UniProtKB/Swiss-Prot annotation, chains A, B:
Its EC number is 2.4.2.10, 4.1.1.23. GO terms for biological process: 'de novo' pyrimidine nucleobase biosynthetic process; 'de novo' UMP biosynthetic process; pyrimidine nucleobase biosynthetic process; UDP biosynthetic process; UMP biosynthetic process. This is Uridine 5'-monophosphate synthase. It comes from Homo sapiens. The lineage of its organism: Eukaryota, Metazoa, Chordata, Craniata, Vertebrata. UMP binds at S35, D37, K59, T60, H61, D95, T99, S150, Q208, Q209, Y210, G228, R229. It is linked to Orotic aciduria 1: A disorder of pyrimidine metabolism resulting in megaloblastic anemia and orotic acid crystalluria that is frequently associated with some degree of physical and intellectual disability. A minority of cases have additional features, particularly congenital malformations and immune deficiencies. Changing G207R: In ORAC1; increased OPRT activity; reduced ODC activity; reduced OPRT and ODC activities. GO terms for cellular component: cytoplasm; cytosol; nucleus. Keywords: Acetylation, Decarboxylase, Disease variant, Glycosyltransferase, Lyase, Multifunctional enzyme, Phosphoprotein, Pyrimidine biosynthesis, Transferase.
Length: 257, 257
């Protein structure tokens, strides 16, 4: 009954950003999102260029780049177009709608001008989505809602997660999916992206907890693994990305049957 | 039984940032925080200079400033020192500890270098605090935890709010208080700052809901009102700030008896 990524890309209610993502995931045999958690633009762009072919998405934290400029994002877009991946700015909007509108469009970062995807916490209520949508819908962007978190003590559980899902299913013109640790929506037009991923067991010293690609894609039913340190701390980041890609892709294939 | 701000500033377990804030609130007879939600540095600095004497705190969203530079924050610090108010960067950190550490210290904004106070959502678990504290404690900064929000559909209620309070009471070396709509902690060393404040009833079109200074300081027991549009959209921002200051200050005095 599970549809392939390529088939999900054609669903009637699919958002165009999700459809583009699903089509390139199927074409490239990748459901890996690189979390490019680096402070130097040159390293961001060298990673994007070398690992571009292995990834479906590159997740940025632009407010940790020491040398951010809009020109850096222009170069990143050139690579995303060349290698075919989407740019996800992991900004975690989490304010009232009137504020996030300006945070998304304006300031130094002009996030909406270069990010295909952004994410938002649902704790403020649906005004967070409505505010972002006022900017993002005209710019043909999409939003991910944070339905679960991977860190110890996360409060994004139970009824909070269910509120996130309902908020997404009510704003499907702009919300394309979730950050979660598992499948949280039964609707196949919604993407599920899962961080806290490493091939080995463990965590970090600040509350991160890791699960494997096979677990999060296979058993828990998510679509895309978001990997940072498991790739970016490795000596050979390209081979590491390929290891994560093959893991997440096989897990997806085995789930479909 | 309620202690004055000046007395709370001397409590044994008071954090130095809170003590400094409480002492200047008492000296200046102001418990008003200006939410300086503007896009131009010149307007930010003209507001800070003119309204400085009327406020205990200026809350920034630096990621909406079109013309942010570190020099703008240097000029803002000069005014905060001159007029005696604290600078609160309303960044709403809301990520895993390892990420927020870098978001706080680094990037273009170097928030920890100029903000006396920042705030954090508790949804990631206590790693968000631990990560920020790794930067902020050495820099003698403080953090506010978001225990409630003013916007329609807020999920920061019930057990979520109680988790925020517990997280604050367990990280009192760095957490100085809360963003909330009411008193949520019975411990007087913790500040309570309340946004969603206007003299008239109403809201905005993106989910903001307003309550009056008398209600939030008087009946609901909060310490400081955070006001944006009720001041910044008025023609005479100084007279508006004075109106809000007198409202919040009288409400506090009447509560003490
Ligand atoms: O629940 C969540 N957990 C999580 O780690 N992230 C983010 O995803 C990345 C994980 O990085 P690594 O731990 O793999 O090195 C970091 O950039 C976090 O900010 C996230 O967005 N949501
Ligand atoms: O619950 C919350 N509600 C809230 O409005 N704020 C913030 O406080 C300010 C309110 O602005 P006004 O509605 O008064 O013009 C804006 O800068 C919001 O981002 C906040 O931080 N928390
Ligand atoms: O991607 C493709 O080519 C096919 C078309 C139908 C679904 N998948
Ligand atoms: O601020 C003051 O001067 C007094 C001293 C004790 C408490 N308040």
């Amino acid at each position: 009954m599970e549809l392939s990524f390529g088939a999900r890309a054609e669903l009637p209610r699919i958002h165009p950003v999700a459809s583009k993502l699903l089509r390139l995931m199927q074409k490239k045999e990748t459901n890996l999102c690189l979390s490019a958690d680096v402070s130097l633009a040159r390293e961001l762009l060298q990673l994007a260029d070398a690992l571009g072919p292995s990834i479906c998405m590159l997740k940025t934290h632009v407010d940790i780049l020491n040398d951010f400029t809009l020109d850096v994002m222009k170069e990143l877009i050139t690579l995303a177009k060349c290698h075919e991946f989407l740019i996800f700015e992991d900004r975690k909007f989490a304010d009232i709608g009137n504020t996030v509108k300006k945070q998304y469009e304006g300031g130094i970062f002009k996030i909406a001008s270069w990010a295909d995807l952004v994410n938002a916490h649902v704790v403020p209520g649906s005004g967070v989505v409505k505010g972002l949508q006022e900017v993002g819908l005209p710019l043909h962007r999409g939003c991910l809602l944070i339905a679960e978190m991977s860190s110890t003590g996360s409060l994004a559980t139970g009824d909070y997660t269910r509120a996130a899902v309902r908020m997404a299913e009510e704003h499907s013109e702009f919300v394309v999916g979730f950050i979660s640790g598992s499948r949280v929506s039964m609707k196949p037009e919604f993407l599920h992206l899962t961080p806290g991923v490493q091939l080995e067991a463990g965590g970090d010293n600040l509350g991160q907890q890791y699960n494997s690609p096979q677990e999060v894609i296979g058993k828990r039913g998510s679509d895309i693994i978001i990997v940072g340190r498991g790739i970016i701390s490795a000596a050979d980041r390209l081979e590491a990305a390929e290891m994560y890609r093959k893991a997440a892709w096989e897990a997806y294939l085995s789930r479909l049957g």
